[PDB]
């Protein structure tokens, strides 16, 4: 196929959302490829692991002078550049990103059904969209747009969210089929406190978000954590100890 | 013009509510009919001072309504105030309403919401494939008004309360027209985003239990409320009550 | 019948609170005696309103010299002895007590199935009961023991609360059959937040009991209030309105 | 005697918890064993730590369990730390056993709880005809096991965890043995009643998100809390860490 599901693994400990999301969806009947990009500094001991369960491992690095000016004039903006490397895989005719610390519980090819750019609205400014899942198509001309735009502009919160919500900025009042459901990228604060909501149609979440400064990975060898955002921790290392821990060795 | 700005007053003390509302309406380039409903509860001292701000104050006594309003309100007691706010429907002198709780605000001119069709609201912040039942667009009609009702006496609410109730009527809110999603702007529940767009805001909604009117006189929000209320609304008590 | 409902009503304003409870109570087919207990401040009108509602108006004042020494050594506990007259009814053989800042939502007959000292548990310290409804059996001898007791050692809240909670200490662990069930003394405090319990058993309730500085009769010509406790307020306003506000003309 | 007290540690962060509950118990008249049920996910580091506490440390690995086990986790995916804590009922070389949350503390021996029978457990404060689920008295059993899981299957919870579950299934709790109500002392969720009846406590219980290890170093039970981490917890750290 000519569709992939793609994530990003900046560095070594990353990598093991990276490794439990990629299980996630291999454990969901995989219908297309599986690319994970990462940085020099991820070591050819979690290249040869993350090679077991993706079908790409992509190191992003410097490469055309568009890019170089992005980078070099903004160097906060390294991972946000790094993550948009996503639209340069022209090989592939539409994606699904999936930020690192994100969770599959079920089979979500139906998002290929929808078209760039596709993304879940994000909870307290609900009029962005949340950068965790989208839905784009690879395009060196969109690359070359972005990059400009982010050596132009920056970005309005220091992270690739601000960056894409501002280039993406109709995305609130155009076209409502590329609102994904909250389902696909249901956020871990919602699940802080048992709310209405949250009860009556959280159990029909396909993909979780695992957000705050505390990731699933940081519970193994001092911030509030709720019993509901237990319940999806307990999912998530589910997945680690039976489909990624065997590969490490 | 057929169209009218409608909030509800369930007590004397969230009348506090309704008439800042009502008044930072009036503030800016009025153009619509101000309606408050209430409850019979509501004194006869406050009816006075709503008429002030009001061209329509509407008692609404489930008790004395027609039997299936009665009857909804027998078989779901707790729904009582979601039942007087769903009254709202029943105005039919009017084509095209826009629904403002009383813990709303309002920053300017908003009538460009009457250019949207029923049922148009904001995303609620909390699970934004739910609306927030704070601020909506709708056409008032017995017939809806008896869909409501009997949706409410079949399946109550999820939350206990309107937004609940409002949710599970007009279900396909999230993924049909959005044409009929309100920007948040509209109904502004108070991050980056806040200071990037926060300054744009025309409504805002002072949400939780602890209301304007709870505190002794963010924080530049709750300012703005009580200017309004210093400035517009106080003075209504004292002249009514000479 | 020789069985009664009492409350008590301390001054005109608490009388509305009585009025409202009284007629809940006649609502919900009325089958025994309904009884106010007032103070001397309660003016003339209120009694002959409250008279329109209650089969008995009686007026509590200063009596024995064991009544006497309580009243005049503790005038902190003035009201509390003034309810505790409820005990020297002994023309009735069992009654209820129900503050009169309570509404019953349905009949509660089957509460004098119940034998002394039945109430149900207060939030907060669950092995107290609260003490805004009860069932008791009106008794000289067992008036004579509490004002003796409330002589002797007061009461560790300086109402009528802790007194009772400490003259039938044994309520949390004698006999589950004087436990009323929480329906039928339901604080409007436990409704603040829309709590998993209180929206799976709280379409049960068959009293509530509002708490707080802010009675419902405080709403009518700036504590916090929820939603789910205004629908009870609503409540009380609505037998107000349809069943009190005709009385007083 | 074939009795134990049983806790339940989920993550290695929890474990702290365990850790400090467990040593309470050692420091009051020990005469029962200590269980720790954990998940796969809690190291080997830990697990080692654990041991130094607990008689059993007993992993529970809901897919590598019996089919019934394996069919409830995946048909309730959120009820996985939930079927993770009902396995204390699968203890059977136990007759009787005590649980206690992480999220507890023991003032004093409380031995005297195996004097109860199945199922005994203190009122909850919100709503006191619940009992609260950190602390109960019950008897190991497959039978009781499986019956908890086919509830589960069927009814899941209401609050989405084990003490909606565990009052569900116990649900005459309220209306039949007064002997089966462990005195509030017994899980202080911690007025004019507190001051009173404070001073007994026997166990002490956390609620909310907000445990004793999420702070760094009302008050008095926390000071006793981190009093009993820094003299009896911290140390096992260091000296398994050498
Ligand atoms: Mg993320
Ligand atoms: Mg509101
Ligand atoms: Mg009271
Ligand atoms: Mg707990």
Known sequence: TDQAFVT???????????????????????TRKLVVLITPQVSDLLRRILSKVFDEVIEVNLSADYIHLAFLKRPELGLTLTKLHCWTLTHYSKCVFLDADTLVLSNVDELFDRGEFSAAPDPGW??????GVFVFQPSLHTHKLLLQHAMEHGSFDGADQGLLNSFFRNWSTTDIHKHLPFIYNLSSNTMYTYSPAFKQFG???KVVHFLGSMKPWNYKYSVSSSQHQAAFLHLWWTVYQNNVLPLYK
């Open 8 to 30: 990003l693994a900046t560095n070594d400990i990353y990598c093991q959302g990276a490794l439990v999301l990629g299980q996630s969806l291999r454990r969901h009947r995989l």
């Open 126 to 131: 609900p009029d962005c969209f949340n950068s």
């Open 203 to 205: 159990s029909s979440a």
